[PDB]
Design a protein around this ligand. Structure first.
Ligand SMILES: N[C@@H](Cc1c[nH]c2ccccc12)C(=O)O
Ligand SMILES: N[C@@H](Cc1c[nH]c2ccccc12)C(=O)O
Ligand SMILES: N[C@@H](Cc1c[nH]c2ccccc12)C(=O)O
Ligand SMILES: N[C@@H](Cc1c[nH]c2ccccc12)C(=O)O
Lengths: 104, 104, 104, 104
DNA sequence: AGCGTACTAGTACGCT
DNA sequence: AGCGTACTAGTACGCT
């Protein structure tokens, strides 16, 4: 939400800035300053939502439990598992297969 | 927005789920799959908000422009600059001083 | 609003000046002069904002009403409840659990 | 600032709530939870402003330096010393004289 | 359906 | 005079 422009016009300024973040975080990891950087850059709520999403993504690829079970284990809405499910469908083959290795 | 509990109870699990994210992303960067991973894990809006926060944090450390100017440059609400400002106050000395190197 | 520095520089002096306040107020309570001391030391507006914050913090721990409700009851902006909410998230376990005793 | 009503009407709700704070802090001091309580209740900026005010009040009573000097030592505006000066004028005799003991 | 929370809008006010 | 920041207004959006 950033006053939703859907405008091809400047959805561009708010991407090169995102890449600047991606790069800075990159250095942070290398200097071991990623944790405080992520504490500075994300809110507590964002960090938690992210915790849940990795579990969802992991378990989905794992496929050892129905989505209804996953939702119970995590205390999540089913909508949130579907978001992971559809996103995963769109992820590149490379990413999906690398995830099934590290995450499994 | 996950049933806000402040609950000493399990803010640890979701916290441990969050650390699982931190580690995975760590690997992603190392394997050069961070970009799609972050495209899979965050929504377009989160990516953008993050772009703006790096700018805010950078310009605040830089301290060459008032916050009223920063707000006009970024098209942000003053409240968002204050969140960065207060957060920065809370950041570790280590982090603030490294940011002022890479980010300046 | 005192020349926001984040400056490792002297955030200790002003911090040590702040601790001088904490100790003086301590004495005030013990001698029953806290009320005028607090009338001397804070402005009318700070006292009032503080009244609203205790309510927010109390009601959030209590967790019996939604934040939309809290906001109407108190005539506050939602942003002010979120500040309380996030602040509470960061409070030590000792504090949150004692608050839930005296404040509930 | 709380949308400035000057209205004798409800400047009252936003006083009994303030007394609730004064009382809660009281307990906090007794149980040694005043520090985290004050970290939860005040913003960083409020704590710092408070450090400066105690110094101002102490030094004014002390009267060993002109106000122009005080201002330099503290890096304060002269307006801020005048607020202290005028407030001190209005403080009860009891308070002023107790201050001159503990603070001097 | 409801709820928590980050955000752009634009104020007041304590400070230097 | 200028500046930092807490606030009421009311949005969007991720969540359960
Ligand atoms: N940790 C910050 C995250 C944040 C939100 N908005 C920001 C703007 C700038 C920098 C950081 C932030 C917070 O919880 O408030
Ligand atoms: N890219 C995903 C991000 C996401 C949101 N919720 C999720 C839950 C699980 C995994 C990913 C997500 C999206 O925009 O929808
Ligand atoms: N420490 C809190 C102080 C605060 C501001 N607004 C609040 C509302 C409720 C409770 C605490 C607060 C902060 O800096 O944000
Ligand atoms: N009661 C004082 C609070 C105050 C503001 N600035 C100060 C400076 C010094 C001492 C007290 C103060 C007032 O409303 O003005």
């Amino acid at each position: 939400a950033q006053q939703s422009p859907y405008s091809a016009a400047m959805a561009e300024q708010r991407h090169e800035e995102w890449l600047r973040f991606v790069d800075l975080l990159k250095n942070a990891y290398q200097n071991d300053l990623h944790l405080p950087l992520l504490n500075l850059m994300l809110t507590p709520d964002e960090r938690e939502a992210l915790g849940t999403r990795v579990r969802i993504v992991e378990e989905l690829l794992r496929g050892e439990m129905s989505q209804r079970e996953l939702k119970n284990e995590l205390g999540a809405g089913i909508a949130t598992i579907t978001r992971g499910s559809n996103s995963l469908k769109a992820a590149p083959v490379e990413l999906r297969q690398w995830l099934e290795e590290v995450l499994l």
